[PDB]
Assembly symmetry: C2
Homo-oligomer: 329 residues x 2
Amino acid sequence: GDLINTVRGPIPVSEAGFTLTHEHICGSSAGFLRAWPEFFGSRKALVEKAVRGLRHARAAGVQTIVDVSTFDIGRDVRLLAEVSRAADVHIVAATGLWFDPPLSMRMRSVEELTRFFLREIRHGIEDTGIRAGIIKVATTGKATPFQELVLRAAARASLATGVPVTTHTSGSQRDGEQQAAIFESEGLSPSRVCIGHSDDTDDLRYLTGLAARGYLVGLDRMPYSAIGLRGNASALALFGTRSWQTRALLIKALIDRGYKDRILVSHDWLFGFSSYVTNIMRVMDRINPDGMAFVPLRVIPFLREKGVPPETLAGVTVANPARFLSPTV
Amino acid sequence: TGDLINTVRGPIPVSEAGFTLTHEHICGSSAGFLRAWPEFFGSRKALVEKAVRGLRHARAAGVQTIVDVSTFDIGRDVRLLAEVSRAADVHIVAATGLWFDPPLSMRMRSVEELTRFFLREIRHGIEDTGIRAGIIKVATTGKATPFQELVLRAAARASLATGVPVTTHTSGSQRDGEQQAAIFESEGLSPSRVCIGHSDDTDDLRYLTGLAARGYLVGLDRMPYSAIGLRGNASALALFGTRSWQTRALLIKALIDRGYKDRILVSHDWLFGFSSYVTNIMRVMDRINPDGMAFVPLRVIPFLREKGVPPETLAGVTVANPARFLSPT
Ligand SMILES: [Zn+2]
Ligand SMILES: [Zn+2]
Ligand SMILES: [Zn+2]
Ligand SMILES: [Zn+2]
């Protein structure tokens, strides 16, 4: 069977199992973790929290997370490897570019961005030999000309290697149509693309449209429920309405319409967050102490109460991630 | 009574500094970019080999020390600096602070948080290396942004606590030194601890003598950037400006012939690797200035001595002025 690159080497597809497709170990910035580890307290304390948070998720049944932290999110793959061993949970690193690219990237052409994505997928990240197994992009509304270059190079890298592509959208936007049109003009099939953060909006026909076209619907922000008055305006902006049941009911909504094979459910959670207000992580731990165990401990039983069969959720959590992470040339 | 400054190899006394270039770069990149994609420079080894050959060419021309004012967001690899320092046998001073390409993990911080980060790389060390920075680089492009004010204030407070000096980036034509000097003084920073850089990008001798009279060091640090009618490319004419190196060097004669030889610092603002601009800009630069950072001791100094400046006045500017500038209070 096919193999999938992890931060501990390649693993057979059958061993991925229960997989979260959009997660972060640390949401920071390029080189920030090395230069200022005291921002989190200490690098030792961040490894402790991440390892402890993953063993809690592993106890609930999670076996693999897809860390979609890219170069400009501060992806330190050695940190991803250290917590993958002490917790015994497969982690799949990513390549691509978020929406905080340093100008050493913003000045690059699409051909140059293609060679850098290919390097991290085929050669390895930095100097570790660890390769990524997924590509991450991002757009802010009407995508910038450079963001359009990024979307082009990611699809060209995906066509050469078969590695999938997952996107960042302000799900409360219609970046999906804009991202899909650029992907379709590059000849990439929608079965290798995930329009992430689709659970922010309540537009059902926008989700059904993506799935009917073959795209993977990433409902990957489940624990971000309505904040109420339990946080500042910064929290309410990034965490706010609606409730997590409203997000989880979008899984039930697509399943009832025959698109059970087009769903990927995750948390978009992290254990370190530097690209936002300070101590936002303590707010997120008040709202969700389960962390990456939220979906197995809370989302799965909530759907099961509403009459969703467990074989259907066993395909959304295991079958589709295995199908989507397998390099398809 | 016992003064010494931190280099990338460790503390050395001020007496052993000598001929010092006060604003140079080994590599102009972005944070974490060198180790993530070193093939952009052909190879990391080739970047070292070219850098070591360049500094030996400068020490053969009399250069004994340079200051690498590359910050975290300029791609400063303190280990790369330590390697080329021992290999070329040239003292190099590292730098903390922030340039005008900070990531989200930096733009989202407050004045105290940035003050602690600056104090970290000055007292504790940079990254996990134990190498301490001996200067602070701040940057405003025209009028200062609200974030750049917080940086300029965090540099003044960190300077007062450690006695370490501060150098700036200015769009010399817009006279950023006026607003920069006002905030440095509102934080209680003695003007003799600050150097307004890129002051030779303007002919405003009323603006230059004003800063020298107030007690600031004047950074005439872009000497080799002589604009040639090279036809292009448009990116080349935008980086080299419009004026000749004789015009830049004559600004040294004007400030000496004004009474402020104690207030001048001369440098190249040169580098051996450029990723934060267009591709192959480094080849165009080495084509124009083949002497690299030996341009000033080989061309500028003989030009000024031909214009009548005594060698004793020149020795104080290139040796005594930087030594006085780096010795902490
Ligand atoms: Zn996202
Ligand atoms: Zn995310
Ligand atoms: Zn500059
Ligand atoms: Zn510079």
